[PDB]
């Protein structure tokens, strides 16, 4: 009852070729020690069975030097095997990052962020990428998708957890054994000696990135950002990072996100690091009257009280990284939960999507998913004034097709009014 061959998608993106599992998986490396650079074969991949969960979750321990596209094909190969060739492609990648332990928040605020995230996830069929550990905002997001999983008929959206290997109590268990492990018991309550951080039982996949160390965090940040960028280019979907509370590595995650072109949405009033990022963005870009008293000194005081760098050089690097995140005003969208309305978080997510680099038609399709007719109308009017008639005519047909499939009559009237010939609509597949 175990797979022997897998359908790995070709680099051309036109079809899937069938190849042996050991042949595809040979390209993934492991480090026996910190000193090692070239490495040895990994052999730690399979599925984990968690208590009170019906479905099993695949896991792969891979190295920092491994290609993130290869990992993307690997994820595509599992989904293609399990759900068939015509599985539901993602139109949104939702990355949830933040505090692992320091995440303390009031229940109403938590309920509001959870409610907005649940609605966005259920309307857009988004792939949510969080941490692989059983703590904080990642565990909370896991609980949200746990409740989400008891609906939507057959298909369940994946909850990918990317975590640094070396902190996992069941690390010895996935090392010991032969390369295939289909049913393996995971014991989160077992007292394992040199490690204390368990995996979240509600995550549907796991990528444990290893570089050779024990009890060291943050080694998977660059690969996670690169993997999101690779997924975003492959599925033509915008990637939106969300920053709720967070520590120093969340700042580094945001720095990686803004360097790789991925937009971020910082929820102001939800935490310390979020307040620092929101404060920096509001100081550099916001034209409102109440932000004119913002200074570098108060920002430096906020960084010192939040991150506790101990030394001036560390404080300078943290301050520089925080200022480097909010350099480009398009890539950061700040949602003020404690000031603005309850139902404007999806508008902030949509603003980040529209400010990102992507085609206009896909963004209109994304706007159609969130049911924001006014945003699409304003975008269409702005697009109409700025010329670019060839790209609008090239994407209007598929946007109209998407509008027909997803039951949006107001959107069909909109798209049909902007010179869309009714008889030039085309099907997605080939007959």
């Amino acid at each position: 009852v175990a797979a022997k061959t897998l359908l790995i998608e070709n680099e051309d993106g036109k079809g899937s070729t069938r190849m042996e599992v050991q042949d595809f998986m040979k390209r993934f490396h492991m480090h026996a020690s910190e000193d090692d650079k070239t490495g040895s074969p990994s052999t730690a991949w399979g599925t984990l069975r968690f208590p009170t969960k019906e479905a099993t979750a695949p896991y792969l321990r891979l190295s920092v030097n491994d290609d993130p596209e290869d990992a993307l094909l690997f994820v595509k190969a599992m989904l293609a095997q399990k759900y068939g060739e015509t599985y539901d492609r993602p139109s949104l990648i939702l990355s949830v990052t933040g505090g692992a332990r320091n995440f303390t928040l009031p229940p109403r605020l938590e309920t509001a962020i959870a409610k907005g995230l649940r609605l966005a996830a259920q309307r857009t069929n988004a792939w949510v990428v969080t941490g692989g550990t059983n703590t904080g905002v990642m565990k909370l997001t896991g609980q949200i998708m746990e409740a989400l999983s008891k609906t939507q008929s057959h298909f369940i959206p994946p909850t990918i957890g990317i975590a640094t290997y070396g902190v996992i109590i069941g690390g010895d268990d996935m090392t010991r054994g032969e390369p295939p492990k289909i049913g393996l018991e995971y014991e989160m309550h077992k007292k394992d000696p040199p490690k204390t951080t368990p995996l979240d039982d509600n995550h549907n996949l796991f990528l444990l990135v290893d570089d050779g160390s024990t009890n060291k965090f943050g080694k998977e940040i660059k690969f996670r950002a690169a993997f999101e960028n690779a997924a975003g280019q492959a599925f033509a979907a915008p990637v939106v990072t969300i920053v709720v509370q967070g520590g120093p590595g969340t700042l580094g995650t945001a720095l990686q996100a803004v360097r790789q072109g991925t937009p971020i949405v910082v929820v102001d009033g939800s935490g310390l690091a979020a307040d620092v990022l929101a404060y920096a963005y509001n100081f550099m870009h916001n034209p409102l009257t109440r932000f004119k008293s913002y200074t570098i000194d108060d920002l430096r005081q906020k960084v010192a009280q939040t991150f506790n760098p101990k030394s001036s050089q560390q404080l300078t690097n943290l301050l520089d990284s925080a200022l480097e995140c909010v350099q480009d005003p398009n890539l950061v969208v700040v949602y003020s939960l404690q000031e603005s309305g309850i139902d404007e978080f999806d508008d902030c997510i949509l603003k980040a999507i529209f400010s990102s680099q992507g085609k206009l038609g896909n963004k209109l399709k994304q706007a159609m998913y969130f049911d924001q007719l006014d945003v699409a109308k304003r975008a269409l009017s702005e697009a109409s004034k700025n010329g670019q008639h060839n790209e609008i005519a090239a994407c209007i047909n598929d946007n109209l097709m998407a509008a027909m499939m997803h039951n949006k009559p107001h959107f069909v009237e909109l798209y049909l009014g902007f010179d869309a010939k009714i008889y030039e609509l085309k099907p997605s597949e080939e007959v």
């Binding site: 009257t289 004119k292 008293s293 200074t295 920002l299 430096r300 300078t316 301050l319």
Partner: protein, 305 residues
């Protein structure tokens, strides 16, 4: 609320320093510069380390033993490099090498002193723990020109952004190829040319990538028609040695209306990877003494810093 705040700062405008009562000492630091130990792009060659309280030439410092190192690129003798034997060359006046004029005058009040043993010049701005030319091609003063193209940082509504009661500026910054830290565009003065052409040429080459648009270029010429030399200072450049040091002339091109600045299509070229518009504040980490240069341009324009 914005108009009330603007009028409030429009109506508000024996020096004594009482900070000694809080700390319990003085400042006691002139901010003396000591370059990092590993010389850039030299394959791990390290200088002879000296403390920041031993750099000035008035102070004796008997244990000073610098290392003489010259880079292979400089030692291969290109067109922009001076000869390895510095004899018969006259400093502090404009000197003609191969019929081309070179400045050779330092902004230091004492001037450049000539060593009797080897004929090499000695840096008047202090010790750097390293003799020889290093990565710099010319003996003594390497005159550099920096181009600070500025515009007021404006919101979509057209209002100028205001922080700490002063209007906020914005400048074009390039990412350097060698050490990947952001900096002001600029470069060394070529033979037979002046600071105006050099400053402009480096701005088109680095920030715009021109060469290696007719009327818009003419617009750029309009941009280039109003420039003020704001400072001529000594650089705290990590490639500096005891026999070759960088001194910069800063040229500020300010766009009051913002029309000329809006026509620039920023695209990194030559020795620059990426170029972008960047807000001026005191926590900026830029290459050499570009923070001092940005301080001088905001000081001259009464902008935020």
């Amino acid at each position: 609320i914005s108009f009330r705040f603007s009028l409030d700062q429009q109506a508000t405008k024996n020096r004594l320093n009482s900070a000694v009562a809080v700390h319990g000492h003085t400042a006691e630091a002139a901010e003396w510069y000591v370059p990092p130990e590993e010389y850039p792009k030299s394959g791990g060659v390290k200088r002879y380390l000296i403390d920041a309280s031993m750099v000035p030439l008035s102070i004796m410092c008997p244990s000073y033993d610098p290392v003489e190192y010259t880079h292979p690129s400089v030692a291969a003798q290109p067109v922009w490099a001076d000869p390895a034997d510095p004899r018969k060359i006259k400093f502090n006046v404009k000197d003609e090498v191969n019929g081309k004029v070179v400045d050779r005058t330092s902004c230091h009040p004492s001037g450049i002193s000539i060593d009797s043993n080897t004929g090499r010049p000695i840096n008047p701005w202090g010790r750097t723990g390293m003799t020889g030319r290093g990565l710099l091609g010319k003996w003594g003063v390497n005159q550099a020109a920096d181009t600070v193209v500025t515009r007021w940082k404006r919101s979509p509504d057209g209002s100028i952004l205001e922080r700490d009661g002063k209007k906020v500026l914005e400048f074009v910054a390039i990412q350097r190829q060698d050490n990947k830290m952001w900096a002001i565009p600029g470069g060394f003065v070529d033979n037979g040319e002046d600071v105006a052409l050099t400053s402009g040429r480096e701005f088109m080459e680095e920030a715009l990538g021109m060469g290696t648009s007719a009327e818009s270029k003419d617009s750029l010429a309009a941009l280039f028609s109003s420039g003020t030399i704001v400072a001529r200072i000594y650089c705290e450049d990590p490639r500096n040695t005891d026999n070759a040091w960088v001194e910069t002339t800063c040229v500020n091109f300010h766009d009051e209306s913002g029309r000329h600045a809006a026509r620039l299509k920023l695209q990194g070229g030559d020795d620059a990877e990426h170029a972008r518009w960047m807000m001026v504040h005191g926590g900026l980490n830029l290459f050499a003494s570009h923070r001092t240069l940005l301080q001088h341009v905001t000081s001259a324009l009464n902008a935020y810093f």
